[PDB]
Symmetry: D2
Amino acid sequence: CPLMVKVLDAVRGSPAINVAVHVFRKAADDTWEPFASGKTSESGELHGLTTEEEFVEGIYKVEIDTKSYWKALGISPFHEHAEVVFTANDSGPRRYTIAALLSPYSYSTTAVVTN
Amino acid sequence: CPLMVKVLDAVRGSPAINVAVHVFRKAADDTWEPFASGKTSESGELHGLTTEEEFVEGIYKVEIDTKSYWKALGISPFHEHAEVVFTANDSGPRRYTIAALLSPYSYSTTAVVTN
Amino acid sequence: CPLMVKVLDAVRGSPAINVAVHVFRKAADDTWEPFASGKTSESGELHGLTTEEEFVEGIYKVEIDTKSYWKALGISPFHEHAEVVFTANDSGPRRYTIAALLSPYSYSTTAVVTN
Amino acid sequence: CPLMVKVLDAVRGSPAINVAVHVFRKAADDTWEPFASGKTSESGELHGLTTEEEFVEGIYKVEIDTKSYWKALGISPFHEHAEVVFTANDSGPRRYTIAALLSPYSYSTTAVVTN
Ligand SMILES: COc1cc(CO)ccc1Oc1ccc([N+](=O)O)cc1[N+](=O)O
Ligand SMILES: COc1cc(CO)ccc1Oc1ccc([N+](=O)O)cc1[N+](=O)O
């Protein structure tokens, strides 16, 4: 699993379940091409987006559909979505965790890059 | 001043100065068109992006060029930029402050919206 | 104004108003003695806590009464308060802004320190 | 494991290893009595602080020794430590994760309370 997404809810103090997540790769013409997607699990985690073979160096975007999350909870949010854009680079045997902590008008995201 | 951007540096404990910010507005054809741009001042704030006349309802994207920021300081950061996307003025004119706090592998953004 | 405190509410996207703040300074006998207190204003800011004469070197603790804040709004939050502890003025006088962003199960705090 | 601590480093994008963590329980005389302690592992996690039998309702403080962490990395930090203070309450079969994300002049903490 070279790429995992983990989302927490700062209002409820819980994993953010069933949040849709879309990952894109930047193509040679500078467009974003769909790469991988899924819905966070009960643990707020999304595993199995990609494989080491397909996850080559390049620029990726991870879009977390925060607006739908909040709306399903009856809560008015600010952002359309949260976007995390980064370059994946093969300097070493790397796993990338993209973590996000959500509030209705604020979010933070952090990258945990290990081995 | 219906739209202001404020950026702080969590490593230095200081305003993040000379950060480039580009704003875009989703067009009729579903494309991101350029709307305004600027750079943060010595206080980390960016004022004068737009006017209340110009700042009509729409979906806006505020792209904060954090990578250029960290690179100019000898740090190779994780993200390309921080993107903040939101619907604005959908219940009449409001004043928006988009704040961001930056670390090399992590950022948070919050919106303060006043009437 | 060598010490200012600013608090925002990540659920509302607004300044966090009427937040009580107590400041303490570690004494010669290793005890937390009362130093100053106040409440955030309509802009979420707390000014006038101390003076440059009074604000000598020391270890200070800024206790932000987030539980009282959230309770007055029908929310049962996780934390009792947010505590910010730091050495101040150890290389001469500085001006400190202690900022905090609050959600019911989460908070962040940052310091901006200027000369 | 009713109480687990997880610490991340926002500057390096990694777990924060070998951070000392001290947990206290508030006694009837309002003093903090040592309760449990340890050092975060290679995964930035600290498991096995306590047991369900000993972790009764009450007010606890978790102190994360952030200053020593940063100093061991050659980095000048702002806070003496990060403190997280909360009431543990038996409304349900609960596991408490106290997470913290560290930067030299900023930290965030979140509580993830599950089952
Ligand atoms: C405050 O702790 C977190 C802060 C952020 C800000 O974006 C994101 C996640 C946080 O909590 C975790 C982050 C990463 C993580 N991980 O899989 O290495 C685990 C986290 N956690 O507290 O369970
Ligand atoms: C973590 O507290 C803050 C977070 C952000 C971005 O998520 C922006 C400001 C925060 O607190 C402040 C810190 C400094 C400051 N200032 O004027 O030097 C103002 C702040 N604030 O509360 O807007």
